[PDB]
Subunit: 219 residues, 2 copies
């Protein structure tokens, strides 16, 4: 059958693209002659982040102690809580900057997989392509959102000696958490999720039999 | 809707492919004193290895003993290699069985509400099994026929010694690749074949209650 023959060529191609996606998610993908894999380049960006947050932590502890003394030279429960809360908010804007760089890295990987299977490609292809692009846009929007949400999470804590001790606990834990999560979000949205959603849409092209021969030409 | 039918089927197929990857990479959920697929293969190979090494010792001394006393001498090395062939093909068969069981379970989960549609999917699982297992077996036998190509005593003893050592490793190789790596990948491509006839969609969705 010539119907069977036609099935082999198209059906074989679509899977191969998806298999390379799996390599991309795991820091295993095949890369150009003197390029660096996506996973390694991300690691460098995260180290710069670590430093910024550490400085914040030392600042906060002193601020409350001194606040009491200076005014001299627990009815104000609302006022003292406010000071620690505001130190953590100062970290927010830096976090989003890092996000942007990383999604640029990922796009380069992903595009080389697609092109590889499909480049001798002009009426048939494209449609597929557009799924690659739309999902780029979408995910980067989402990633920024989650970072900002994370910071509003951080607005919740953790005699005169018991209020002091308690409230200060909150500051310390808060710093470590910010350091770890801002790098995480970036990877989660723009490598794992990005890849997987593409795959399902790519299976959709197979439906139309009488669009068979209509799909195949390679000229 | 025509629009509903399309998206429901497209989505299900794409999830099926993800599960096949897990099975292939030795991370499926298993029992406590049970053992994972990938380890299971290794136990089978160890048994193979010990039998082969016996054969290597016999060859060397036989040819020597007759020289204390041309084609009559070359006949003995070729008969020694030959004896390993029939055991090899046996072990191919059992490893195939174990991998095959995992794959079929994924097909079932996705298409229980499409009775006609499920039948074709499952059939693709078997087709890929058939084809590769034939090839596997073929390559074992070809390997032996290859081995059957061969004062003069000293030059000829180097070929006797070397030969045997090869067989030990190769039979395992075929068994590993054949019905693990290929089995998965090519299977996936057959599954999108269901998509073709949207005029057939109503037929696929025919239920058991009114046949």
């Amino acid at each position: 059958e010539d119907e069977n023959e036609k099935m082999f060529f198209l059906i074989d191609k679509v899977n191969a693209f998806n298999q390379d996606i799996t390599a991309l998610m795991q820091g295993e993908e095949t890369v150009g002659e003197e390029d660096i894999r996506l996973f390694t380049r991300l690691r460098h960006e995260f180290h710069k982040w670590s430093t910024i947050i550490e400085n914040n932590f030392q600042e906060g502890h002193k601020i409350l102690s001194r606040k009491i003394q200076k005014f001299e030279n627990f009815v104000n429960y609302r006022t003292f809580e406010t000071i620690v809360k505001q130190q953590i908010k100062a970290l927010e804007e830096p976090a989003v900057d890092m996000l942007h760089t990383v999604t640029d890295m990922v796009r380069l990987a992903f595009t080389d997989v697609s092109i590889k299977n499909f480049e001798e490609f002009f009426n048939l292809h494209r449609t597929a392509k557009s799924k690659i692009e739309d999902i780029r846009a979408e995910q980067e929007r989402e990633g920024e959102k989650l970072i900002r949400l994370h910071f509003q999470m951080e607005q919740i804590v953790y005699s005169m000696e018991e209020i002091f001790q308690h409230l200060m606990a909150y500051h310390q834990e808060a710093s470590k958490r910010i350091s770890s999560h801002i790098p995480l979000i970036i990877q989660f949205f723009m490598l794992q999720t990005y890849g997987q959603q593409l795959q399902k849409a790519m299976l959709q092209l197979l439906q139309d039999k009488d669009t068979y021969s209509w799909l195949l030409k390679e000229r």
